[PDB]
Design a protein around this ligand. Structure first.
Ligand SMILES: [Zn+2]
Ligand SMILES: [Zn+2]
Length: 65
């Protein structure tokens, strides 16, 4: 356990949703913050590669600007 360790990811740090077996866990690679299907419901492309990466809405703005 150091930092981004899903091991303790059972509560979205954005909305505060309670993860479970019915919902899957998500985690933004740009900022490094675990998000739920509600905050991670977005995919933006990166200039370092041709592929839609999944990032929280917030980061989505840092790339669409
Ligand atoms: Zn959320
Ligand atoms: Zn982010």
């Amino acid at each position: 356990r150091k930092w981004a360790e899903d091991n303790e990811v059972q509560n979205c740090m954005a909305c505060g949703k309670g993860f479970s077996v019915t919902v899957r866990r998500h985690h933004c690679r740009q900022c490094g913050n675990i998000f739920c299907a509600e905050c991670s419901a977005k995919n933006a492309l990166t200039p370092s590669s041709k592929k839609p990466v999944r990032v929280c809405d917030a980061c989505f703005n840092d790339l669409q600007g």
